[PDB]
């Protein structure tokens, strides 16, 4: 003797409906005979009705600042039911776009953190972290930590195991990231951890030793930072690499015209900190390399050793500098994540 029932995921009259989720309508004691959704201009949204006729759902992205009208009719054996629902979606003050590293499909070293950089300051860090789904295989515990107002990083306690798949789903579209700011879009990346490559620069020997899966494969005489501009000790993540680059001290805050400044074109340069530490070709210091520290902070090595390093070291490999007269690389450098104690990194700084 029964009347079909409709259940929609939105209510007639709702405002600030968030656009992170599809809109659905379900029939009970009947099936769906017509479902249309239309924006404020009359333009159809459309979606998919399940084969059994019980569940309809939008299949495309719904937009910010829209007024949508949903019409639905369920026919039962015991009669009909029609509903019309009109609702408004979120109206952002601003949009932020995330950027993920490392690159999709890349193979990286064991020190590569997952990085989500937003193009605006994030007022609700908690909401951002909750929108980011990380899958690891083999599964391994990790945690988020913020390097600044825009960039959050995720990593395990220890260096990744080689062969780990890492999947990163940044599901920020439709999510309120605080003070009126909503994600511009979703982004996705997937990467894999490659060989373990750790290079150690010991100031006691002035040798940079590259170890691949625990074996020494290269031993590089090096000249590090002179006593007045020493190389900071600690763990550096390998970033980008250049056949040649102009090193401009202005990039890192220091005027070229200034006393500690510089502008020099160099070869075979591998970046290991945002503060501007590189491993690079230094033909002028070949005689100092292995003996005395002469640089601004860079790991000077021979031209063939620098090119070797460019060819054999990858994004996410590790350089550890030890025994220098300098301090420790900042944990928030950009490439100094591993210098923050796990207890502190785990507890995070979302609040
Ligand atoms: C390589 O020599 C680079 C260079 N490395 C350092 C560094 O270790 O930061 C310098 S000096 C920055 C500083 O504040 O030193 C203390 C002196 C008061 C610079 C970034 C260049 C060629 O990229």
UniProtKB/Swiss-Prot annotation:
Annotated TM spans: none
Active site: residue positions: 280 (proton donor/acceptor), 298 (nucleophile)
InterPro entries the UniProt entry points to: Big_10, LD-transpeptidase, LD_TPept_cat_dom, Transpep_catalytic_dom
Pathway(s) per entry: Cell wall biogenesis; peptidoglycan biosynthesis
Principal subcellular localisation of the protein: membrane
Pfam assignment, any one: YkuD
Gene3D superfamilies, per the entry: 2.60.40.3710, 2.60.40.3780, L,D-transpeptidase catalytic domain-like
Activity regulation behaviour: Is irreversibly inactivated by the beta-lactams carbapenems via the formation of a covalent adduct resulting from acylation of the catalytic Cys; imipenem is the most efficient drug for in vitro LdtMt2 inactivation.
SUPFAM superfamilies given in the database record: L,D-transpeptidase catalytic domain-like
Broad EC category: transferase
CDD domains in alphabetical order: LDT_IgD_like, LDT_IgD_like_2, YkuD_like
Coiled-coil region list: none
Domain L,D-TPase catalytic, residue spans: 197-322
UniProt subcellular location: Cell membrane
EC number in record: 2.3.2.-
UniProt free text on domains: Consists of two tandem immunoglobulin-like Big_5 domains in the N-terminal region (residues 56-145 and 150-250), followed by a L,D-transpeptidase catalytic domain (residues 251-378) and a C-terminal tail (residues 379-408).
PANTHER family found in the cross-reference section: L,D-TRANSPEPTIDASE, L,D-TRANSPEPTIDASE YCIB-RELATED
Function of the protein: Generates 3->3 cross-links in peptidoglycan, catalyzing the cleavage of the mDap(3)-D-Ala(4) bond of a tetrapeptide donor stem and the formation of a bond between the carbonyl of mDap(3) of the donor stem and the side chain of mDap(3) of the acceptor stem. Is specific for donor substrates containing a stem tetrapeptide since it cannot use pentapeptide stems.
Protein name: L,D-transpeptidase 2
Annotated gene: ldtB
């Amino acid at each position: 003797l029964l009347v079909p029932k409709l259940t929609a995921s939105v209510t007639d009259g709702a405002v600030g409906v968030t656009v992170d989720a599809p809109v659905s309508v379900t029939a009970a004691d009947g099936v769906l005979a017509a479902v249309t959704m239309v924006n404020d201009n009359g333009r159809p949204v459309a979606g998919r009705l399940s084969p059994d006729g019980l569940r309809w759902s939008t299949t495309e992205q719904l937009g910010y600042n829209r007024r949508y009208t949903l019409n639905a009719t369920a026919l039962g054996l015991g009669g009909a039911a029609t509903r019309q629902l009109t609702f408004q979606t979120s109206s952002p003050a601003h949009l932020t776009m995330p950027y993920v590293m490392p690159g999709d499909g890349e193979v990286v070293g064991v020190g590569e953190p997952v990085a989500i950089r937003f193009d605006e300051n994030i007022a609700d860090r908690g909401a951002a972290e909750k929108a980011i789904k990380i899958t690891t295989n083999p599964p391994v515990e990790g945690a988020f930590y913020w390097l600044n107002n825009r960039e959050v990083r995720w990593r395990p306690e220890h260096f990744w195991k080689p062969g780990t798949a890492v999947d990163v789903a940044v599901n920020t579209y439709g999510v309120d990231l605080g003070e009126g700011m909503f994600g511009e879009d979703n982004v996705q990346t997937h990467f894999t951890i490659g060989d373990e490559v750790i290079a150690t620069a010991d100031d006691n020997t002035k040798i940079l030793t590259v170890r691949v899966n625990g074996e020494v494969v290269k031993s590089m005489p090096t000249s590090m930072g002179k006593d007045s501009t020493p190389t900071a000790n600690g763990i550096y993540i390998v970033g980008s690499r250049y056949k040649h680059i102009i090193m401009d001290s202005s990039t890192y805050g220091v005027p070229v015209n200034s006393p500690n400044g510089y502008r020099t074109d160099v070869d075979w340069a591998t970046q290991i900190s945002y503060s501007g530490v590189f491993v690079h070709s230094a033909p002028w210091s070949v005689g100092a390399q292995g003996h005395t520290n002469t640089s601004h902070g860079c790991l000077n090595v021979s031209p063939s050793n620098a090119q070797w390093f460019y060819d054999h070291v990858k994004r996410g490999d590790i350089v550890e500098v030890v025994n220098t007269v300098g301090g420790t690389l900042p944990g928030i450098d950009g490439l100094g994540d591993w210098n923050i104690p796990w207890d502190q990194w785990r507890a995070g700084n979302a609040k």
